[PDB]
Enzyme design. Structure first.
Site, PDB file in Angstrom:
ATOM      1  CB  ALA A 142      -0.929  -0.009   1.209  1.00 58.95           C
ATOM      2  CB  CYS A 143       4.136   1.773   1.488  1.00 62.76           C
ATOM      3  SG  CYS A 143       5.592   2.825   1.701  1.00 62.76           S
ATOM      4  CD  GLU A 209      13.850 -16.092   8.091  1.00 63.15           C
ATOM      5  OE1 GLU A 209      13.496 -16.350   6.915  1.00 63.15           O
ATOM      6  OE2 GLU A 209      15.010 -15.721   8.377  1.00 63.15           O
ATOM      7  N   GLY A 211       6.174 -16.061   6.756  1.00 57.49           N
ATOM      8  CA  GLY A 211       5.221 -15.460   5.803  1.00 57.49           C
ATOM      9  C   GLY A 211       3.805 -15.235   6.322  1.00 57.49           C
ATOM     10  CD  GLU A 212       1.614 -12.293   2.720  1.00 52.11           C
ATOM     11  OE1 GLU A 212       0.703 -12.723   1.980  1.00 52.11           O
ATOM     12  OE2 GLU A 212       2.415 -11.406   2.350  1.00 52.11           O
ATOM     13  CG  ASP A 251      -6.084  -3.462   4.097  1.00 50.14           C
ATOM     14  OD1 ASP A 251      -7.083  -4.029   3.595  1.00 50.14           O
ATOM     15  OD2 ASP A 251      -4.933  -3.560   3.623  1.00 50.14           O
ATOM     16  CG  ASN A 256      -2.549  -7.136   6.682  1.00 47.46           C
ATOM     17  OD1 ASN A 256      -3.340  -7.628   7.506  1.00 47.46           O
ATOM     18  ND2 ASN A 256      -2.892  -6.149   5.846  1.00 47.46           N
ATOM     19  CG  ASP A 272       1.069  -3.863   5.695  1.00 46.34           C
ATOM     20  OD1 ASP A 272       1.945  -3.285   5.017  1.00 46.34           O
ATOM     21  OD2 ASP A 272       1.004  -5.103   5.832  1.00 46.34           O
TER      22      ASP A 272
END
Lengths: 376, 390
Positions: A142-143, A209, A211-212, A251, A256, A272
């Site tokens: 988003a940045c 390490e 992730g999501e 969001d 995230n 975020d």
């Protein structure tokens, strides 16, 4: 004074390696060429006479986003070949990294071109590269760009997010804002490790390490109810902490919610600061609470509560898609909480405090598990 | 069978060039090394004996974004130097493209490493590369990556935007949506030149050599009123066309008004209208900050774009005394600096005012804008027609 933007590598002896600094290079027999097939070694050759007075040129040009693009232009009669294929008389094309330049014959490989306008680490403020080695792109946020980096000496992975100052340049703000986020000290929140300021803003963050949450939930796979509980508990603590420090997420989504290892039981960390948009926004703390409901729904079920009449119609009317076959193995309490969180009216929706007091979360065993992992 | 992910280049004769295919390479004197300092040429050397049995290794590893990262690891005693600096005994670091490997002495340059995980053509669907040559990244959009490309034979620049199908993969849509946008035919709208479907969606679009209206307007520079007029006229035609084809923009701003050359007089082209529909604030209408009137939203946006064009500053900004940006917009009191506006025509100022009206029912429509006196310039209209021949 200037750094080279390309190396050319001689494949046949009797050819010099070239390091491109100037904007334009002509290759040929002609004396006037910036790169001349004249070396008295090469001159006795018969294939030497197959090369043109003015054979080909390599050159730069400003890219449509202030970038630089390297082109080759063939001006020969017996041909300039690039990766086997003929460029052709008067013709012109872009020069990819690791291209092979042949002359007169396809087989007759002479040069390998390497673009240095890539990793090109000069592109960054020196203060930063003195401290870090910039690596691959991790995504587009988003940045702007979030890139992988390594601490010069420790060799530790970190995430560096890059935002452009040009973005607001019509008519600074971030510097004061960073310091507030920098003071934050909690094991389930991403640490803002460092901060730089050049033509762009660079924000060094700790890299996760594992992730999501997204990956553990994409492709119809689902998480054990206890794992959902562990994660969601942590998510509640995280969000509450944010809320208490006057930050509303806005969001929250699986992409995230970050995991700290490939172990199933582990620390969740948030980052975020539309499937997830609150119905009232489609018509401010409640917003995050609705989001968690959705994240929760997806965790327990393996599918989304609203998918693609309109997606908006489903959300505003709050009739989530309930599949009996999928939910039968999920507890009544879990289902209950989801419903409390997925309420159209924000005044009715459960708050995070109300969620934490909900029966589903009264698991003194998983609470202990969370405490354990803080020691880890 | 596999393609090499790196080339190593020998700087001293008596060393072989290496093309890395395997996941790991040990360099050293030892017979067991995948790359051996054993060549009977190199053996007579005295600095040969300065190199270790097992000197260093180069290797791959899977990266967090399914990536591959090349590392070097020094295992020597007299040192492995990378770009002058010592890596060190037992130490390990990432290997940047075009790195210099020296051995035993900083000065003693032996290898230059080239990463080939640098944009390769074969990462993309073949149907696409048969038609295009993928180039540099142009930016990170609301979709994903937009990259520069060239038509294989014409060598014309095009923009290809790349969206991931993995993004919606929890629980196709775009294929039908693309065809609607594809039929659109207006000179002030971006043409969707082509479309591909692999693990990712690739959408080939025409590239605008002039970049964004934004750049011509950032940094307190401003545009000649006649250039504003040219651009804004085109912007009106563009938006009207969209509106008539049942598309409402919703996010019109200088960064998505595109220009077709570095010439001042030139074609404007609009973008991200259904690209702001494919996935589902200075410019936000006050009523959105509070059916077929959703059009007013675009009309407010143009007023803003117009204001910024003529003045070189924004009608509403953030400052620590004037309270909120939202307050200014909802109350519709734009920031008017006499020193800046004195040189701008009455009519131009007039239109801006008509467009910047809080009540959507009062706001000028695009038809009303085009009939406004400021735009009654038969000369600039002719100019527009000329450029269509260009």
């Amino acid at each position: 004074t200037p750094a080279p933007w390309a190396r050319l590598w001689a494949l046949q002896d009797g050819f010099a390696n070239l390091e491109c600094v100037n904007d334009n290079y002509w290759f040929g027999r002609d004396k006037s060429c910036e790169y001349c097939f004249d070396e008295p070694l090469l001159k006795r050759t018969d294939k030497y006479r197959t090369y043109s007075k003015k054979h080909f040129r390599i050159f730069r040009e400003v890219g449509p986003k202030n970038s630089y693009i390297a082109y080759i232009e063939d001006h020969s009669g017996n041909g300039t070949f690039v990766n086997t294929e003929l460029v052709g008389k008067g013709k012109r094309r872009p020069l990819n990294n690791n291209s092979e330049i042949a002359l007169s014959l396809s087989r007759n490989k002479v040069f390998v071109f390497f673009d240095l306008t890539v990793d090109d680490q000069s592109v960054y403020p020196k203060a930063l590269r003195d401290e870090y080695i910039m690596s691959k792109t991790l995504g587009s946020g988003a940045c702007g760009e979030v890139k992988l980096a390594f601490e010069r000496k420790t060799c530790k992975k970190v995430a560096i997010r890059i935002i452009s100052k040009r973005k607001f340049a019509i008519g600074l703000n971030v510097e004061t804002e960073i310091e507030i986020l920098k003071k934050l000290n909690h094991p389930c929140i991403i640490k803002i490790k460092n901060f730089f300021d050049a033509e762009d803003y660079y924000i060094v963050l700790e890299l996760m390490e594992g992730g999501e949450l997204f990956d553990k939930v994409v492709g119809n796979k689902r998480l054990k109810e206890a794992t959902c509980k562990l994660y969601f508990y942590q998510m509640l603590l995280a969000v509450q902490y944010l809320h208490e420090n006057g930050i509303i997420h806005r969001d929250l989504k699986p992409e995230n919610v970050l995991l700290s290892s490939q172990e199933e039981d582990c620390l969740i960390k948030i980052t975020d600061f539309p499937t997830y948009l609150a119905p009232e926004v489609l018509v401010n703390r409640a917003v995050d609470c609705w989001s968690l409901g959705v994240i929760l729904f997806i965790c327990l079920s393996g599918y989304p509560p609203f998918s693609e009449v309109s997606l908006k119609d489903q959300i505003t009317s709050g009739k989530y898609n309930f599949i009996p076959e999928v939910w039968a193995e999920v507890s009544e309490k879990a289902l209950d909480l989801v419903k409390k969180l997925l309420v159209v009216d924000p005044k009715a929706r459960f708050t995070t405090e109300e969620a934490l007091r909900h029966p589903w979360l009264q698991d003194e065993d998983m609470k202990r598990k969370f405490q354990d992992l803080l020691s880890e």
